[PDB]
Coordinates of C-alpha atoms (C1' of nucleotides) in Angstrom, one line a residue:
Chain A
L10 CA -4.9 4.8 30.9
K11 CA -3.3 1.5 32.1
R12 CA -4.5 1.4 35.7
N13 CA -7.5 2.1 34.1
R14 CA -7.7 -1.0 31.7
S15 CA -4.9 -3.3 33.3
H16 CA -6.7 -2.7 37.1
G17 CA -10.0 -2.0 36.2
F18 CA -12.6 -3.7 36.9
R19 CA -13.1 -5.8 32.9
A20 CA -9.7 -7.0 33.5
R21 CA -10.1 -8.2 36.7
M22 CA -13.3 -10.4 35.6
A23 CA -11.7 -11.3 33.5
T24 CA -9.7 -12.8 35.9
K25 CA -11.1 -15.3 38.7
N26 CA -8.5 -14.3 40.7
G27 CA -10.0 -10.2 40.7
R28 CA -13.6 -11.1 40.6
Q29 CA -12.6 -12.7 44.1
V30 CA -11.1 -9.1 45.2
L31 CA -13.8 -7.4 43.6
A32 CA -16.6 -9.5 45.7
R33 CA -14.4 -9.2 48.9
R34 CA -14.6 -5.4 49.0
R35 CA -17.5 -5.0 48.5
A36 CA -18.4 -7.3 50.9
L42 CA -12.1 0.4 45.4
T43 CA -9.0 0.8 44.0
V44 CA -9.6 2.1 40.3
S45 CA -12.3 5.0 39.2
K46 CA -12.6 6.2 35.5
Chain B
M1 CA 24.4 34.2 -30.0
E2 CA 27.5 34.4 -28.2
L3 CA 27.5 34.6 -24.6
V4 CA 29.9 37.2 -23.4
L5 CA 32.8 36.2 -20.9
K6 CA 34.3 39.0 -20.2
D7 CA 37.4 38.1 -20.6
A8 CA 38.2 36.1 -24.2
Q9 CA 35.0 36.4 -25.4
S10 CA 35.1 31.9 -25.9
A11 CA 31.6 31.2 -25.9
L12 CA 30.6 28.1 -28.1
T13 CA 27.4 28.0 -30.4
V14 CA 23.4 28.5 -27.8
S15 CA 21.0 26.6 -30.0
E16 CA 18.4 30.1 -30.4
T17 CA 15.6 27.2 -30.3
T18 CA 16.3 26.1 -27.2
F19 CA 18.4 29.1 -25.2
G20 CA 16.6 31.8 -27.3
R21 CA 12.8 30.8 -28.4
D22 CA 9.5 32.9 -26.9
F23 CA 9.3 34.0 -23.1
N24 CA 5.2 31.9 -22.5
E25 CA 4.7 33.8 -18.5
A26 CA 1.9 31.7 -18.8
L27 CA 3.2 28.5 -18.5
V28 CA 5.9 29.9 -16.7
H29 CA 3.9 30.6 -14.5
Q30 CA 2.2 27.1 -14.0
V31 CA 5.1 25.2 -13.3
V32 CA 6.1 28.4 -10.8
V33 CA 3.0 27.7 -8.9
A34 CA 2.6 23.8 -9.1
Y35 CA 6.6 23.9 -7.6
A36 CA 6.1 25.2 -5.0
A37 CA 2.5 23.7 -4.1
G38 CA 4.5 20.5 -4.2
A39 CA 6.9 22.1 -2.7
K95 CA 1.1 16.8 -11.0
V96 CA 4.0 18.3 -12.5
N97 CA 4.6 16.6 -16.6
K98 CA 8.5 16.5 -18.2
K99 CA 7.3 17.9 -21.6
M100 CA 5.8 21.3 -19.6
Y101 CA 8.7 21.3 -17.0
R102 CA 11.7 21.2 -20.3
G103 CA 9.4 23.9 -21.4
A104 CA 9.3 26.0 -19.0
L105 CA 12.9 25.9 -17.9
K106 CA 13.4 26.3 -21.7
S107 CA 11.6 29.9 -21.7
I108 CA 13.6 31.6 -18.0
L109 CA 16.8 30.6 -19.9
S110 CA 15.4 32.3 -23.0
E111 CA 14.1 34.9 -20.7
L112 CA 17.0 34.8 -18.6
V113 CA 19.6 35.0 -21.6
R114 CA 18.1 38.4 -23.1
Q115 CA 17.8 40.3 -19.8
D116 CA 21.3 41.0 -19.2
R117 CA 20.8 38.9 -16.0
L118 CA 23.9 35.3 -17.5
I119 CA 27.0 35.4 -16.9
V120 CA 29.3 32.4 -18.5
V121 CA 33.6 31.8 -17.5
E122 CA 35.3 29.3 -18.8
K123 CA 35.3 27.6 -15.8
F124 CA 34.2 29.0 -11.6
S125 CA 35.7 26.9 -8.9
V126 CA 38.4 28.1 -6.4
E127 CA 42.0 27.2 -5.1
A128 CA 41.2 26.1 -2.3
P129 CA 37.9 25.5 -0.2
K130 CA 37.8 27.8 1.5
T131 CA 35.6 30.7 2.2
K132 CA 37.6 33.8 1.5
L133 CA 39.6 32.5 -2.3
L134 CA 35.5 33.0 -3.1
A135 CA 34.5 35.9 -1.5
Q136 CA 37.3 38.1 -2.4
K137 CA 36.4 36.4 -5.9
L138 CA 33.0 37.7 -6.3
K139 CA 34.6 41.3 -4.7
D140 CA 36.3 41.4 -7.9
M141 CA 33.7 39.9 -9.8
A142 CA 31.4 43.5 -8.1
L143 CA 28.2 40.1 -7.0
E144 CA 27.0 39.6 -4.0
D145 CA 23.5 38.0 -5.1
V146 CA 24.9 35.0 -7.7
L147 CA 23.8 31.9 -8.4
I148 CA 26.7 29.0 -9.1
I149 CA 25.5 26.3 -12.2
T150 CA 27.9 24.2 -13.2
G151 CA 28.3 20.5 -14.5
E152 CA 30.2 18.2 -12.0
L153 CA 29.5 19.0 -9.1
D154 CA 32.8 21.0 -7.7
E155 CA 34.0 20.1 -3.8
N156 CA 36.0 22.8 -3.1
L157 CA 33.2 25.5 -4.0
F158 CA 30.4 23.5 -2.4
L159 CA 31.9 23.0 1.0
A160 CA 32.6 26.1 1.0
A161 CA 29.6 27.5 -0.5
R162 CA 26.9 26.4 2.2
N163 CA 27.2 29.2 4.9
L164 CA 26.9 32.1 1.6
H165 CA 23.6 33.5 2.3
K166 CA 22.8 35.2 -1.1
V167 CA 25.0 32.8 -3.1
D168 CA 23.9 28.9 -4.1
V169 CA 26.1 26.6 -5.8
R170 CA 23.6 23.3 -7.6
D171 CA 25.1 21.0 -10.6
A172 CA 22.7 21.3 -14.1
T173 CA 20.9 18.1 -12.7
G174 CA 20.3 20.4 -9.8
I175 CA 18.8 22.9 -12.0
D176 CA 14.6 23.7 -10.4
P177 CA 13.1 27.1 -11.2
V178 CA 12.9 27.8 -8.1
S179 CA 16.5 28.4 -7.9
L180 CA 17.9 30.6 -11.3
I181 CA 14.3 32.3 -10.4
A182 CA 15.0 33.5 -6.2
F183 CA 18.6 34.9 -7.2
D184 CA 17.8 37.6 -10.9
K185 CA 22.1 36.8 -11.2
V186 CA 22.7 34.0 -12.4
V187 CA 26.8 33.0 -13.4
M188 CA 26.8 29.4 -15.1
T189 CA 29.8 27.1 -16.5
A190 CA 31.1 27.0 -20.6
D191 CA 30.4 23.7 -20.2
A192 CA 27.1 23.2 -18.3
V193 CA 25.9 24.4 -22.2
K194 CA 25.3 20.9 -23.4
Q195 CA 23.9 19.7 -20.5
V196 CA 22.1 21.5 -19.7
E197 CA 21.2 21.3 -23.6
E198 CA 20.8 17.2 -23.0
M199 CA 18.6 17.3 -19.6
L200 CA 15.8 20.1 -21.7
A201 CA 16.0 18.3 -24.7
Chain C
rU1 C1' -15.4 -4.8 -16.7
rA2 C1' -17.2 -8.9 -17.3
rG3 C1' -21.3 -11.4 -14.0
rC4 C1' -24.4 -12.0 -10.2
rG5 C1' -29.4 -9.1 -7.8
rG6 C1' -38.8 -10.0 -7.3
rC7 C1' -31.5 -8.1 -13.9
rG8 C1' -35.5 -3.5 -9.4
rA9 C1' -32.7 -1.4 -4.6
rG10 C1' -27.1 -3.1 -4.6
rC11 C1' -22.4 -6.7 -4.3
rG12 C1' -18.3 -7.2 -7.4
rA13 C1' -13.3 -11.9 -12.0
rA14 C1' -10.1 -13.5 -14.3
rC15 C1' -6.6 -14.1 -17.9
rG16 C1' -1.2 -10.9 -18.7
rG17 C1' 2.6 -6.8 -18.1
rG18 C1' 6.2 -4.4 -14.8
rG19 C1' 8.7 -3.9 -9.8
rA20 C1' 11.4 -5.7 -4.3
rG21 C1' 12.6 -10.2 -3.5
rC22 C1' 12.7 -14.8 -6.6
rA23 C1' 15.5 -20.7 -2.5
rG24 C1' 15.5 -24.3 -3.2
rC25 C1' 15.7 -28.2 0.1
rC26 C1' 15.9 -32.7 4.0
rC27 C1' 14.6 -38.0 4.1
rA28 C1' 11.4 -41.4 3.1
rG29 C1' 17.9 -46.2 1.1
rA30 C1' 23.0 -48.6 -0.8
rG31 C1' 27.4 -48.2 -1.4
rC32 C1' 32.4 -44.6 -2.0
rC33 C1' 35.9 -42.3 0.6
rU34 C1' 35.1 -38.2 3.7
rG35 C1' 33.1 -34.6 10.2
rA36 C1' 37.7 -30.9 4.2
rA37 C1' 30.8 -26.7 2.6
rU38 C1' 26.9 -24.1 5.2
rC39 C1' 25.1 -23.3 11.0
rA40 C1' 26.0 -22.3 16.8
rG41 C1' 28.8 -22.1 20.6
rU42 C1' 33.3 -20.9 22.8
rG43 C1' 38.8 -16.7 23.5
rU44 C1' 41.4 -13.9 20.7
rG45 C1' 42.0 -9.9 16.4
rU46 C1' 40.3 -6.1 13.2
rG47 C1' 36.6 -1.3 11.9
rU48 C1' 31.7 0.5 13.2
rG49 C1' 27.7 2.3 17.3
rU50 C1' 25.6 2.6 22.2
rU51 C1' 26.3 3.7 27.5
rA52 C1' 30.6 9.5 30.1
rG53 C1' 32.3 13.3 27.5
rU54 C1' 37.2 17.2 24.7
rG55 C1' 39.2 21.3 21.2
rG56 C1' 36.5 24.3 18.3
rA57 C1' 37.2 30.3 14.1
rA58 C1' 35.2 36.0 14.2
rG59 C1' 34.7 44.3 18.0
rC60 C1' 34.6 48.0 18.5
rG61 C1' 33.3 54.1 17.9
rU62 C1' 29.6 57.9 17.8
rC63 C1' 23.8 58.7 17.9
rU64 C1' 18.7 57.6 20.0
rG65 C1' 17.2 54.8 24.1
rG66 C1' 15.1 51.7 31.2
rA67 C1' 19.2 48.5 29.7
rA68 C1' 20.4 48.5 22.4
rA69 C1' 20.6 42.6 20.7
rG70 C1' 17.7 49.4 16.9
rG71 C1' 20.0 51.5 13.1
rC72 C1' 25.9 54.9 11.0
rG73 C1' 31.2 53.8 10.2
rC74 C1' 34.8 51.0 9.3
rG75 C1' 36.7 45.6 10.4
rC76 C1' 37.0 40.4 10.6
rG77 C1' 35.3 34.7 10.8
rA78 C1' 33.4 31.4 7.5
rU79 C1' 34.6 23.1 6.4
rA80 C1' 30.7 26.6 11.7
rC81 C1' 25.6 32.9 8.5
rA82 C1' 20.5 25.6 12.3
rG83 C1' 19.5 27.2 16.8
rG84 C1' 18.6 28.7 22.2
rG85 C1' 19.4 32.7 27.1
rU86 C1' 21.3 36.9 27.7
rG87 C1' 17.7 44.3 30.1
rA88 C1' 14.5 45.5 22.9
rC89 C1' 16.3 42.4 16.5
rA90 C1' 23.3 38.4 18.0
rG91 C1' 28.0 35.3 12.5
rC92 C1' 32.0 37.7 15.5
rC93 C1' 28.4 38.1 24.9
rC94 C1' 27.4 32.7 26.4
rC95 C1' 26.1 26.4 25.3
rG96 C1' 26.8 25.8 20.5
rU97 C1' 26.2 24.3 15.3
rA98 C1' 31.0 22.4 9.6
rC99 C1' 34.8 20.5 10.7
rA100 C1' 38.8 16.9 13.9
rC101 C1' 37.5 13.6 18.0
rA102 C1' 38.2 10.1 22.3
rA103 C1' 36.5 4.8 26.8
rA104 C1' 39.4 1.6 32.1
rA105 C1' 33.8 -2.0 31.4
rA106 C1' 29.8 -4.3 28.8
rU107 C1' 27.2 -5.7 24.5
rG108 C1' 25.5 -4.7 19.1
rC109 C1' 27.0 -5.3 14.4
rA110 C1' 30.9 -7.8 9.8
rC111 C1' 33.6 -11.7 9.2
rA112 C1' 39.1 -14.2 10.8
rU113 C1' 41.6 -17.2 14.0
rG114 C1' 42.2 -22.8 17.7
rC115 C1' 38.8 -26.3 19.9
rU116 C1' 33.7 -28.6 20.9
rG117 C1' 28.6 -29.2 18.0
rU118 C1' 24.7 -30.1 12.9
rG119 C1' 27.9 -31.5 9.2
rA120 C1' 31.8 -31.5 2.8
rG121 C1' 31.1 -33.9 -1.0
rC122 C1' 30.7 -38.4 -5.7
rU123 C1' 28.0 -42.5 -7.7
rC124 C1' 23.1 -45.3 -8.7
rG125 C1' 18.0 -47.1 -5.8
rA126 C1' 13.7 -44.9 -5.1
rU127 C1' 7.4 -41.9 -3.8
rG128 C1' 5.2 -39.4 0.6
rA129 C1' 0.2 -46.7 1.3
rG130 C1' -5.4 -48.0 3.2
rU131 C1' -3.8 -44.1 -1.6
rA132 C1' -7.4 -42.5 -6.0
rG133 C1' -12.1 -44.3 -5.7
rG134 C1' -17.7 -46.9 -3.4
rG135 C1' -21.7 -47.3 0.3
rC136 C1' -25.1 -45.4 4.8
rG137 C1' -26.0 -42.2 8.8
rG138 C1' -24.6 -36.5 10.1
rG139 C1' -21.8 -30.9 9.8
rA140 C1' -20.4 -26.3 6.1
rC141 C1' -22.1 -22.5 3.0
rA142 C1' -29.7 -24.0 0.8
rC143 C1' -30.2 -28.5 3.4
rG144 C1' -33.4 -27.2 6.6
rU145 C1' -28.9 -33.8 5.4
rG146 C1' -28.8 -34.4 0.5
rG147 C1' -29.3 -28.4 -5.5
rU148 C1' -24.5 -32.9 -3.0
rA149 C1' -21.8 -30.0 -7.1
rU150 C1' -17.2 -29.5 -2.4
rC151 C1' -15.1 -30.9 1.9
rC152 C1' -14.2 -34.9 6.6
rU153 C1' -16.7 -39.6 8.5
rG154 C1' -18.6 -43.0 13.3
rU155 C1' -18.3 -47.6 10.3
rC156 C1' -17.3 -51.4 6.3
rU157 C1' -14.7 -51.7 1.7
rG158 C1' -10.6 -50.9 -2.0
rA159 C1' -5.7 -53.9 -7.8
rA160 C1' -1.4 -48.7 -9.8
rU161 C1' 5.2 -47.4 -8.1
rA162 C1' 7.9 -43.1 -14.0
rU163 C1' 5.2 -50.4 -17.6
rG164 C1' 0.6 -46.7 -14.3
rG165 C1' -2.1 -43.5 -12.0
rG166 C1' -4.1 -37.3 -11.5
rG167 C1' -6.4 -33.5 -14.0
rG168 C1' -8.5 -30.6 -18.6
rG169 C1' -15.5 -28.8 -19.2
rA170 C1' -18.1 -35.1 -21.6
rC171 C1' -13.8 -38.8 -21.6
rC172 C1' -12.5 -39.1 -26.8
rA173 C1' -7.3 -37.8 -31.6
rU174 C1' -3.1 -33.8 -30.8
rC175 C1' -1.6 -33.2 -26.4
rC176 C1' -0.1 -29.5 -21.3
rU177 C1' 1.6 -30.6 -16.0
rC178 C1' 3.1 -34.1 -12.1
rC179 C1' 4.4 -38.0 -8.9
rA180 C1' 0.0 -36.5 -5.3
rA181 C1' -1.2 -39.5 -1.1
rG182 C1' 5.7 -37.0 4.9
rG183 C1' 8.3 -31.2 6.4
rC184 C1' 10.8 -26.3 6.4
rU185 C1' 11.5 -22.3 5.3
rA186 C1' 14.2 -16.1 5.5
rA187 C1' 14.5 -11.7 1.9
rA188 C1' 10.4 -8.1 -0.2
rU189 C1' 5.0 -8.3 3.4
rA190 C1' 1.7 -4.7 7.6
rC191 C1' 1.4 -2.5 12.9
rU192 C1' 3.0 1.1 16.8
rC193 C1' 2.8 0.5 23.9
rC194 C1' 6.9 2.2 23.8
rU195 C1' 12.5 5.1 22.5
rG196 C1' 16.9 8.9 19.9
rA197 C1' 16.1 12.7 17.0
rC198 C1' 13.2 15.5 12.7
rU199 C1' 9.4 19.2 12.0
rG200 C1' 4.3 21.0 11.4
rA201 C1' 2.1 28.0 5.6
rC202 C1' -0.5 23.1 13.0
rC203 C1' -3.5 24.8 18.7
rG204 C1' -2.1 29.1 21.9
rA205 C1' -6.0 28.4 27.8
rU206 C1' -14.0 29.3 26.4
rA207 C1' -8.5 26.2 21.3
rG208 C1' -5.1 22.3 22.1
rU209 C1' -5.2 14.7 24.4
rG210 C1' -10.9 15.0 29.6
rA211 C1' -5.6 17.7 32.2
rA212 C1' -0.1 23.8 29.3
rC213 C1' -2.6 24.0 36.5
rC214 C1' 0.2 18.0 41.9
rA215 C1' -6.0 14.6 35.9
rG216 C1' -7.8 10.3 35.3
rU217 C1' -7.5 15.5 40.6
rA218 C1' -12.2 17.0 43.4
rC219 C1' -16.5 15.5 42.5
rC220 C1' -21.2 12.4 41.5
rG221 C1' -22.8 6.5 42.4
rU222 C1' -22.0 0.6 47.5
rG223 C1' -20.1 -0.5 41.9
rA224 C1' -19.6 -0.6 35.9
rG225 C1' -18.4 4.8 35.4
rG226 C1' -19.4 9.8 34.3
rG227 C1' -15.5 14.3 34.3
rA228 C1' -15.3 18.8 35.4
rA229 C1' -13.1 24.6 37.0
rA230 C1' -8.6 27.8 38.1
rG231 C1' -1.6 30.4 33.2
rG232 C1' 0.6 34.9 32.8
rC233 C1' 4.8 40.7 38.6
rG234 C1' 9.3 42.1 36.5
rA235 C1' 15.6 42.7 34.7
rA236 C1' 17.0 41.2 39.3
rA237 C1' 11.4 40.0 44.7
rA238 C1' 14.8 44.7 43.7
rG239 C1' 7.6 42.2 48.1
rA240 C1' 7.6 48.8 49.2
rA241 C1' 14.2 50.8 55.1
rC242 C1' 11.9 54.5 57.4
rC243 C1' 7.2 58.8 60.3
rC244 C1' 2.5 58.3 61.5
rC245 C1' -3.3 57.4 61.7
rG246 C1' -5.8 52.3 62.8
rG247 C1' -7.7 46.8 67.7
rC248 C1' 0.9 44.4 68.5
rG249 C1' -5.8 42.9 63.3
rA250 C1' -6.4 43.7 57.7
rG251 C1' -6.6 47.9 55.3
rG252 C1' -4.6 51.7 52.7
rG253 C1' -2.1 56.9 53.2
rG254 C1' 3.8 59.2 53.0
rA255 C1' 9.4 58.2 51.7
rG256 C1' 11.9 54.3 49.1
rU257 C1' 12.9 50.5 45.1
rG258 C1' 12.1 51.1 41.0
rA259 C1' 11.2 52.8 32.4
rA260 C1' 6.8 51.5 34.5
rA261 C1' 3.8 50.3 41.1
rA262 C1' -1.4 53.5 34.7
rA263 C1' 3.5 46.3 36.7
rG264 C1' 2.2 45.8 44.9
rA265 C1' 1.4 40.2 45.4
rA266 C1' -6.2 39.4 45.4
rC267 C1' 0.7 42.1 40.5
rC268 C1' 0.6 42.4 31.4
rU269 C1' -2.8 44.8 28.2
rG270 C1' -8.9 46.3 29.9
rA271 C1' -15.6 45.4 27.7
rA272 C1' -20.6 46.1 29.0
rA273 C1' -25.1 45.0 30.7
rC274 C1' -24.0 46.7 37.2
rC275 C1' -23.5 50.6 40.8
rG276 C1' -21.5 55.9 42.6
rU277 C1' -18.7 60.4 41.7
rG278 C1' -18.6 66.1 39.8
rU279 C1' -20.2 69.1 35.4
rA280 C1' -23.8 69.9 30.9
rC281 C1' -29.4 69.9 29.1
rG282 C1' -35.3 69.2 28.3
rU283 C1' -38.4 67.6 31.9
rA284 C1' -44.5 68.2 37.5
rA285 C1' -25.6 23.7 9.6
rC286 C1' -24.3 18.9 3.2
rU287 C1' -17.5 18.1 4.7
rU288 C1' -13.3 14.6 2.6
rA289 C1' -13.3 11.7 -2.7
rU290 C1' -15.7 8.0 -7.3
rA291 C1' -18.4 9.3 -11.4
rU292 C1' -21.7 12.8 -15.1
rU293 C1' -21.4 18.3 -17.3
rC294 C1' -19.2 23.3 -18.2
rU295 C1' -16.1 27.2 -18.2
rG296 C1' -11.7 30.0 -18.9
rU297 C1' -6.3 28.7 -19.7
rA298 C1' -0.7 26.3 -21.3
rG299 C1' 3.0 21.9 -23.3
rC300 C1' 2.9 18.8 -26.9
rA301 C1' 0.1 17.5 -31.6
rA302 C1' -1.6 12.2 -34.3
rG303 C1' 0.4 12.4 -30.7
rG304 C1' -0.4 14.3 -25.4
rU305 C1' 1.3 11.2 -20.9
rU306 C1' 4.8 7.0 -18.5
rA307 C1' 2.4 4.2 -13.1
rA308 C1' 2.8 1.0 -7.7
rC309 C1' 8.8 0.4 -8.7
rC310 C1' 14.5 2.9 -9.5
rG311 C1' 16.6 7.5 -8.8
rA312 C1' 23.2 12.0 -5.1
rA313 C1' 15.5 12.0 -5.7
rU314 C1' 9.7 16.3 -6.3
rA315 C1' 15.0 16.6 -11.6
rG316 C1' 15.2 11.7 -14.9
rG317 C1' 15.2 5.5 -16.8
rG318 C1' 11.3 2.3 -16.3
rG319 C1' 5.1 2.4 -22.2
rA320 C1' 1.4 -1.8 -18.7
rG321 C1' -3.1 0.4 -19.1
rC322 C1' -4.9 4.6 -20.7
rC323 C1' -8.5 9.4 -26.0
rG324 C1' -8.6 8.8 -31.2
rA325 C1' -6.0 7.7 -36.3
rA326 C1' -8.4 5.8 -43.3
rG327 C1' -13.4 3.8 -42.2
rG328 C1' -17.5 1.4 -41.3
rG329 C1' -21.6 -2.3 -40.8
rA330 C1' -22.5 -8.2 -36.1
rA331 C1' -19.1 -11.0 -40.1
rA332 C1' -16.9 -11.5 -45.1
rC333 C1' -15.3 -8.8 -47.7
rC334 C1' -14.5 -3.6 -49.5
rG335 C1' -11.7 1.3 -49.5
rA336 C1' -12.2 7.7 -49.8
rG337 C1' -16.8 5.6 -49.5
rU338 C1' -19.0 1.8 -47.4
rC339 C1' -23.7 -1.0 -45.1
rU340 C1' -29.7 -5.4 -45.8
rU341 C1' -32.0 -4.8 -50.3
rA342 C1' -30.1 -6.9 -58.4
rA343 C1' -31.0 -0.9 -57.3
rC344 C1' -33.4 1.9 -53.9
rU345 C1' -31.3 9.7 -55.5
rG346 C1' -34.5 5.3 -49.8
rG347 C1' -31.9 5.4 -45.6
rG348 C1' -27.9 5.1 -41.0
rC349 C1' -22.6 5.6 -40.8
rG350 C1' -17.8 7.9 -42.8
rU351 C1' -14.0 11.1 -46.4
rU352 C1' -6.7 12.0 -43.9
rA353 C1' -14.0 16.0 -38.9
rA354 C1' -5.9 16.1 -34.8
rG355 C1' -6.3 14.5 -29.3
rU356 C1' -4.3 13.8 -24.7
rU357 C1' -2.2 15.5 -19.5
rG358 C1' -2.9 19.7 -16.5
rC359 C1' -3.7 24.3 -13.7
rA360 C1' -8.8 27.5 -11.0
rG361 C1' -13.8 27.5 -10.7
rG362 C1' -19.9 26.1 -11.6
rG363 C1' -25.1 21.6 -11.3
rU364 C1' -26.8 16.5 -10.3
rA365 C1' -26.6 12.0 -7.2
rU366 C1' -23.2 8.4 -4.5

RNA sequence: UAGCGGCGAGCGAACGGGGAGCAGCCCAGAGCCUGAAUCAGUGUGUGUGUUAGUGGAAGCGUCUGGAAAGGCGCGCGAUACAGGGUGACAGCCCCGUACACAAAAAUGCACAUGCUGUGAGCUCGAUGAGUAGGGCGGGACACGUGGUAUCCUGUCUGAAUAUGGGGGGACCAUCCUCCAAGGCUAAAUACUCCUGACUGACCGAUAGUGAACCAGUACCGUGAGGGAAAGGCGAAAAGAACCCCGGCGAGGGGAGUGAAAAAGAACCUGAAACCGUGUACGUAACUUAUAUUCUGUAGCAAGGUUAACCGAAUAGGGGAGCCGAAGGGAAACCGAGUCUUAACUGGGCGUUAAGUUGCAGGGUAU
C-alpha cells in the first residue's frame, strides 16, 4: 500500500525528482 | 401473605397489590423478549412485568426469605456448607446492600449467583428456579417497583 | 415546520429549553510598595504505570475403549468453574485464571523541596485613529459591475473620547446593549496510519482483504495500471528395516510400523457428466431508513412517554418537545351548547365520544 502510493508514479509525478527519475529510467520500481 | 422463613416465621407484611397480583403472561413474555434482544424498554411496563414475575415466584413456593443471608468469612467452603445444610444447589441470592464476603466468595459458583436489590433483572430471576431473598430487601424492591 | 421554487419537479428557518464545560484577561499609562500568586527549567522525595519477571489452591478406583479428556463411585479446591495444549469432552496433567507481588536504569503522570527565568498585588488615568461615514472605476454571490442591498480598494476625503458615538426596520416618545476601529486562549468538541487488550447468535479455501499458501508473486503493457491459481498424512514420520520381480530407473506387488496404509508421501472425508472389469435382462434481482395506512397483542389511563445527558449504567434521575382533555367557531365572546344571519326546525362544529407508548407483520412512493 505505502509502496503503491509513496513509491507510486503519482508520488513521483508530484515531485520534480520523481519525474526526473522516471524520465531517466524510461530513456521500473512500482507495479500495482 | 407472610413469607416462610423455616426458623422464626418473622416475615414482614408484603403488599399483595405488588407481590401478589395476577400473572400477566403476555407482559412478562414481552419484557423477557425485549431484554433478550437488548442483551425500547419502558419504566411502567418493566415494573409491571417485575411485579408479575415476583408474584408468580412467590405463588409457586419457589421463594425463601431469611432474616439475613450471608457468610461469616469470605470463603467459598462456608457458602457451600451453608447451601448443603439448606439442601439446595441452584439458588439466586438477592439482598440489599452489596455483601462483601458473599460477593467475593460467590463468583466461582456456576449455579449460584448473588445480586443486590438495584441489580435485579428478569433474566437473573428466571434463570434460577429458587430464590433466597433477604428480609430487609422487601422494602427496597417495593420502592424500586413502585 | 415557517419560508423559498415557470409556488410544478425540489430546496430548506429562527427563537427557546435542558446537558459537558462555562475563563476572562493582557496592555494601550501613572503611582505605591512589591520579583511574595501563576508558568517553564534544573537536583532531590514520595505514590502510580510501562520497558524484563515471581509465588499461586485440589484425585484416584472400576468398566467401556488405539489412547478416556466417555460416563460409574467415593473425595477435595475455590478471593481461582476466564481460556489454551495434552492419543476423544479437564476446577484437581501443564501454561495460566482471582489474589499477593516485583526494578540496578530511563522516561510519563501528581505535587513538596533549594535555585534561575515570565513574574504577587492595591489605587487612580484611560479606548484599540485616518475611525464611523462620503465620491470615481473594479472583484464575490445576479452582475453579465452596479438589484448595489453587503464586503474590500488604485485614489481624494473624512468633526466623536462613557459630554459623544454604534445598532434596534423607517428615524421617532419608552428605551435595550457596547465603548467597536489591538491579541490570547485549554477543557467539553471529530478523525485513525499505526500500538495493547476485549470481543462477534461475523466469514470457513469458488466464502472471507486482491493475497489463510514466500501476494501486490507469476503474468499482461516500454509506462500509468490490471492481476490471478495454489491448505489439510498422522499421535508421535513411527516416512514402509528387510526377501524377491524390474533397467543400481520409476511403478507396484510381500513383511513390518501402524486404530486405520479404505492415512503412503500425486498423503481426512468422496459424486457425476468420463472410461473398463465381473454378473443378469430384451435386442439383427427493489436492499437499509424517513412518511402514509391496516391487522392482532401488552402496560397505564386522562395520562403514556422523557430524549442527546448523568447513571456501581441496558434498572433508575433528568418534562423540553412529543397525541388529547369542557367546545367551538378567523376574532370579540359565550359555555354544553356555539357560529354569518332580527330568527332560519336552514346549515357547519360540538356535549366529560378517553388516548399514548412498545410488540410481530401486510400495500404506496421517497
